[PDB]
Design a protein around this ligand. Structure first.
Ligand SMILES: Nc1ncnc2c1ncn2[C@@H]1O[C@H](COP(=O)(O)OP(=O)(O)O)[C@@H](O)[C@H]1O
Lengths: 458, 701, 269
């Protein structure tokens, strides 16, 4: 470990490092593990001395130190791939750079089953009630919560029952369990210290979860399947496919949902970058971060990049840097990048030329039958009966998007839970409550200003 | 059979017995009973009616805890005591370490207020004290003429010996502070109390159970708010070994042996298990920046970063930490396998500073003229460390008001005339008149006190908010039964000064969540100073103030801050019972990206208050003093066309200033001033904005 | 003092701090004094080293050598408190603060009086007009002013008369006195080296000290001196005093002097 290099003074730390490596070489075959190498090798203005250059000295020689005769192999592991120098990123010294990333929900759940085989969850425990919402928390945090959930279990015994002695009774440990209230109290503990880095995950939702623009569905399905199902037929014609398609129209129509469905078609990684965090990195002048997330997307193969709100940067340095470093045309990596916006007018005209984001297709409001299918899939979100029809709910809501219908049915559900727990000690009334409120806070006058830019393409 | 808890009520020989515990061993209210103890102790205590604690876990004093000589918090049975006897002839003797130079026969003048009318049951060889005038005395009984368990009677007399007995290390000292001696934040001190108490209960549990200990507790926050004495206090409350590790003493020595000093301190800490160790001022240790010139400070953060993981983990010792800012610390210590879950106690509130006053009233010997709730009033933004310094300055002015002018000293030092002396009211004003604002003035984290009854009007919006802040945290299962999630963003807009800031205290006081007051200008100074790390840190330590609420107003001033609140609201805390107020006065000039669903979206226009609402707000404004009801409040609200709550408060303030003007201009009350305020020249109300706010409401429609 | 502490090599500068602390901890009570704390204790990366950190660390914690039975007390002196370390300024390590500041002209009157107890001034001077033009000067500069005023007075005598010998002539310098144009000549040197910062002062303008023109009087006088005898009467009839008042209108009307007269009326700074 890096602090063990920094433990004693210079010189004798080097000798202990070397002697550890010949005894590793004498224990061939072997693995040598080193962490916090950014603390070992920074290349910034933290060079307030030269002993750090002395400690990367002879390490850079011992990556060349074996002559295809020592069976040993390095194991370097530091979180930031950009905070290392490129001297440690030299080929023939560290060639296979790989990420780990935050686990998926299908990974968080099996983390919870592999960290429950000792302390033995009770019969009421299902572990999906914890695994769903634990985004922004790492498996170390999950082990921390299962440990202190076992602690909140262990405060319930050995003091309230007063069976205390020197040797711990393992039989009452075997009778001991853990409850739902224990686990949600564990969730209420100070978990969110795991950071808010962007998530990489395979999506499990597809076009049975959304309805609308089925020709656009089939066209994007062809564009993401037949380049990667038959690349040899593109070799038969000799030209590469273009992997950029533009989305524009009213927002809140489910542009995140269609990206998850088109990534579920390729069973690809879903990465969704958006405006405010890259503006936050840009105000701190950190375009190396957006280069890094695009690069780790390139080794997130296969992946689909979702990106929206072009208009926040369309009017600017940000589109200039990402237009330069989007040009790493690795279309053979099964990657896919898209562009979503609300107003396509104020975009820079350096996008419409080929070799980049090319296909300008309009994303309108969802159809009434399409929003019937959307709520039909969203009975898991909000169950609807047929005493009032879903299309009967779409008689005057023609100018409403998916987010608009989502928030008004959520308002109806809030009124439902309110008037259900109004009684002091289920569908039709709340849907009529949704029908009888005359809110229309949706911009429906943008139809012709979208249509003029659509018929500019003509 | 019975477990010990901490008691606010500091009177010794008092058991805070639960009422189901009365009939098990036949206990009565005025009577006292025997207790079990390690190395055969007997504690005798009279019953206090305290049913809100457990039947087995009963709140007790820390002085009867010290009387038990238990490690602490352990289970002991109760024997009934039908053999109570008052008797006489009890010889009582003090201890030498408490005697700081108190001259002569202090026996009758300290025993007689302590012994009269108490009838306090007192065993042989037990320990108890009083406090007053910055030191009073511990008394230990040498012998009893009745049974070794005895009760103080009015005819009990002592020999006024004048010679204290030599102290022992078996007794826990009384200057060693405890749980009730710290009064910063009770629920946060509860968090640090049952955070790591399981090694404090049993080291053999974590030597026998494979659950990892919570490895390292860090208390960032305000500078020096008892945090070293907080660690000392919990070290006394576990009864384990502690030795202080000073921050700057790591940087005291030269290179090499400072490593040896810290490492051998860490090694003898492991040798002296069970123990807790604490390092203060880690920003002096690890300010890992570009400001870390040289390399021996990197050597200083090394071996601490080693011996975090160089803990054997069969060794069960626990490291304690405190600093000012959490982000100023080296960021490699945040994760797991490193320092564990961290917390800030923060600035104490009005009730917490009232409690630090009452723990400081005990050793003051003060008169009944002072009440110190008035001290608890204007102590906003003032650390209880500076409050203790203020109390010390009050005592110094009290001993500078008299006894340096009475001149009863040439070399004699009479503490009894110092205890007959007392701190007074204008002495506390003069102590307030020194450098109290040395505490930094930041935003305050406080459990609210203004109730929902203090605001009247807009009961439909109030019903919506009482649904929103309580029914997700009463019934989240009913929320997710139908497949839906609770919202977090609410919208407040309209004319300013109507009372929207006033209801933010009440909406958290009703649901008993925590309150933080986020205001636009200090966020603008953080944005101009580019300290948005401080903005996400105040957001994060608001998130660890759960259950809480996030009140933010005047959001139209922003341009980075809107982008970073969109970043931090993406990682929202659904199960931490939090809620976010979006408030402004000009909602049109802000960007419409924030009003999307999944964000702050629940649109409610907040109108100017109505006439009955204005009557309620005027009534709550006049509830601070007895105001005569000779003036009708509806006629005070009759001419008010657009007079908001700010306008009502400045009108009643002008009435109060003119009333006190005519009160003290006389040579050495309500109706005339209210009529003057209603019938003065000014009618300064912005009335044009109602039309455009209704235009915004018709835009929503 | 700071520079002889930081002058020595590493290691024994700590021992210099050791003798500088407990040469007089046995001499209780005693006073220690670690003046110009900007030179010894800043918080900068300008001090690109560690010996100053090793100096100020354990200084701020072995000023706690009073174990509730000693009587060590420290006076702290520096130029500007913002450049001092705030963890040095943290409570316990260092508690509370006061400023001596710049003297005023009224205080310059008696500093000029009590510095001139030895120089045997003549009756021709008046000493009031001397202290007026030197606003924005430190009392050390006034001590310098009267010092080379005396040196100018003894310079035109005692060598022009050729009274120079190995023995002094006490009768000549006793017959000598400083005078008014000597103070003018002292004013004619580079005295404003004490710079022009902000100033606190007890006011003296009292032509319209009672408030403003018409009912501005009756609000101003209550707002600026009725709290200082009657604090509780405001809470007894309900609420706090006002926070601030606005001055607006035509410029240069003496409103700046009016606030000076307001501060003169309430006997405040
Ligand atoms: N909430 C509190 N409860 C009890 N004591 C407090 C509190 N806040 C501040 N203090 C007092 O403030 C002083 C400074 O706190 P601390 O930093 O622990 O002291 P030091 O730096 O001298 O070790 C302590 O003596 C402590 O008694």
């Amino acid at each position: 470990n890096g602090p063990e290099i920094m433990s004693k003074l210079a010189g004798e730390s080097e000798s202990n490092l070397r002697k550890a490596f010949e005894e590793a070489e004498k224990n061939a075959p072997a693995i040598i593990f080193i962490d916090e190498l950014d603390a070992i090798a920074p290349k910034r203005e933290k060079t307030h001395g030269e002993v750090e250059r002395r400690i990367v000295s002879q390490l850079l020689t011992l990556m060349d130190g074996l002559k295809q005769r020592a069976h040993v192999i390095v194991m370097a592991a530091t979180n930031r791939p950009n905070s290392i120098d490129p001297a440690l990123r030299r080929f023939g010294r560290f060639d296979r750079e790989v990420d780990i990333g935050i686990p998926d929900a299908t990974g968080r759940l099996e983390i919870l089953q592999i960290h429950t085989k000792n302390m033995k969850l009770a019969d009421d425990v299902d572990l999906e009630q914890v695994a769903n919402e634990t985004h922004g928390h790492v498996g170390a945090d999950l082990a921390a919560l299962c440990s202190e959930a076992a602690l909140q279990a262990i405060r319930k015994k050995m003091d309230l029952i007063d069976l205390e002695d020197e040797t711990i009774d393992a039989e009452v440990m075997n009778s001991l369990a853990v409850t739902m209230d224990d686990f949600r109290w564990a969730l209420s503990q100070s978990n969110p210290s795991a950071p808010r880095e962007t998530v990489v995950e395979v999506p499990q939702v597809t076009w049975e979860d959304i309805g609308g623009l089925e020709d656009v569905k089939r066209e994007l399905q062809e564009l993401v399947q037949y380049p990667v199902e038959h690349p040899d037929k593109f070799l038969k014609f000799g030209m590469t496919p273009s992997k950029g398609v533009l989305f524009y129209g009213p927002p809140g129509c489910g542009k995140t949902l269609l990206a998850k469905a088109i990534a579920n078609e390729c069973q690809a990684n879903f990465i969704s970058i958006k405006g405010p965090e890259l503006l936050t990195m840009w105000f701190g002048e950190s375009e190396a971060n957006v280069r890094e997330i695009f690069d780790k997307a390139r080794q997130a193969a296969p992946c689909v990049l979702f990106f929206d709100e072009l208009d926040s940067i369309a009017k600017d340095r940000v589109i200039n840097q990402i237009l330069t470093e989007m040009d790493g045309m690795s279309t053979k990596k099964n990657v896919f990048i898209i562009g979503a916006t609300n107003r396509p007018d104020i975009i820079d005209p350096a996008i419409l030329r080929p070799g980049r984001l090319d296909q300008l297709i309009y994303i309108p409001l969802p159809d009434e039958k399409s929003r019937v299918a959307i709520l039909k899939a969203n009975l898991r979100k909000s169950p609807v009966a047929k005493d009032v029809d879903l299309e009967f709910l779409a008689k005057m809501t023609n100018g409403f998007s998916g987010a608009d219908l989502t928030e008004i049915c959520q308002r109806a559900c809030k009124l439902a839970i309110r008037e259900s727990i109004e009684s002091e000690i289920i569908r039709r009334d709340h849907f009529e409550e949704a029908m009888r409120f005359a809110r229309r806070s949706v911009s429906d006058n943008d139809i012709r200003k979208y249509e003029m830019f659509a018929q500019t393409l003509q | 059979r019975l477990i010990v808890d901490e008691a606010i009520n500091e009177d010794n020989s008092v058991v805070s017995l639960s009422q189901p515990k009365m009939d098990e061993l036949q206990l009565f209210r005025g009577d006292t009973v025997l207790l079990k103890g390690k190395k055969r102790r007997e504690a005798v205590c009279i019953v206090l009616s305290d049913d809100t604690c457990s039947d087995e876990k009963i709140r007790m004093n820390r002085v009867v805890r010290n009387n038990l000589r238990v490690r602490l918090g352990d289970v002991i049975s109760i024997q009934p005591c039908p053999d109570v006897k008052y008797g006489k002839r009890i010889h009582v003797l003090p201890i030498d370490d408490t005697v700081e130079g108190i001259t002569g026969n202090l026996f009758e003048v300290y025993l007689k207020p302590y012994f009269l009318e108490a009838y306090r049951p007192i065993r042989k060889g037990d320990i108890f004290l009083v406090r007053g005038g910055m030191r009073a005395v511990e008394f230990k009984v040498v012998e009893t003429d009745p049974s070794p368990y005895c009760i103080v009677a009015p005819d009990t007399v002592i020999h006024c010996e004048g010679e204290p007995i030599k102290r022992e290390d078996e007794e826990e000292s009384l200057n060693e502070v405890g749980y009730d001696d710290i009064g910063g934040c009770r629920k946060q001190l509860a968090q640090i109390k049952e955070m790591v108490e399981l090694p404090l209960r049993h080291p053999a549990l974590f030597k026998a159970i494979g659950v990892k200990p919570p490895r390292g507790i860090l208390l960032y926050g305000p500078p020096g708010t008892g945090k070293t004495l907080i660690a000392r206090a919990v070290a006394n409350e576990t009864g384990a070994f502690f030795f202080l590790i000073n921050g700057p003493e790591i940087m005291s020595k030269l290179a090499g042996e400072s490593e040896s000093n810290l490492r051998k301190a860490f090694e003898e800490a492991e040798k002296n298990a069970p123990a807790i160790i604490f390092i203060d001022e880690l920003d002096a240790i690890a300010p890992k920046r570009e400001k870390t010139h040289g390399e021996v400070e990197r050597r200083i953060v090394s071996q601490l970063l080693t011996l975090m993981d160089g803990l054997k983990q069969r060794a069960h010792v626990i490291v304690m930490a405190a600093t000012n800012r959490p982000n100023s610390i080296d960021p490699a210590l945040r994760r797991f396998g490193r320092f564990d879950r961290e917390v800030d106690i923060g600035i104490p509130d009005a009730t917490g500073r009232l409690e630090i006053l009452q723990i400081h009233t005990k050793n003051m010997k003060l008169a009944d003229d002072v009440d110190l709730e008035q001290v608890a009033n204007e102590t906003h933004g003032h650390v209880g460390a500076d409050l203790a310094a203020l109390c010390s300055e009050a005592a110094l002015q009290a001993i500078r008001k008299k006894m340096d002018l009475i001149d009863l000293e040439d070399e004699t030092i009479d503490a009894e005339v110092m205890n007959s002396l007392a701190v007074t009211m204008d002495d506390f004003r003069w102590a307030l008149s020194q450098s109290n604002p040395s505490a930094p003035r930041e935003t305050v984290v406080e459990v609210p006190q203004v109730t929902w009854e203090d605001i009247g009007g807009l009961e439909d919006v109030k019903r919506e908010l009482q649904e929103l802040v309580q029914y997700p945290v009463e019934h989240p299962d009913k929320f997710l039964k139908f497949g839906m999630t609770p919202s977090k963003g609410v919208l407040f807009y309209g004319p300013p000064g109507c009372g929207k800031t006033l209801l933010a205290k009440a909406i958290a006081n009703e649901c008993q969540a925590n309150f933080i007051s986020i205001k636009g200008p200090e966020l603008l100074t953080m944005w101009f100073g580019e300290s948005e790390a401080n903005v996400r840190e105040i957001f994060d330590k608001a998130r660890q103030a759960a259950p809480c609420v996030l009140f933010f107003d005047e959001l139209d001033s922003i341009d980075r801050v809107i982008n970073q609140i969109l970043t931090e609201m993406d990682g929202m805390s659904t199960k931490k019972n939090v809620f976010i107020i979006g408030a402004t006065n000009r909602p049109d000039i802000i960007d419409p990206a924030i009003l999307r669903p999944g964000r702050l979206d629940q649109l409610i226009y907040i109108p100017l208050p109505d006439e009955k609402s204005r009557v309620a707000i005027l009534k709550a404004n006049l509830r601070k003093s007895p105001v005569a009801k000779d003036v009708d409040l509806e006629f005070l609200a009759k001419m008010t066309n657009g007079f908001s709550g700010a306008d009502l408060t400045e009108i009643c303030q002008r009435a109060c200033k003119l009333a006190i003007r005519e009160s003290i201009e006389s040579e050495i009350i309500r109706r005339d001033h209210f009529e003057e305020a209603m019938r003065f020249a000014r009618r300064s109300v912005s009335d044009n904005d109602i039309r455009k706010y209704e235009m915004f409401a018709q835009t929503l429609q």
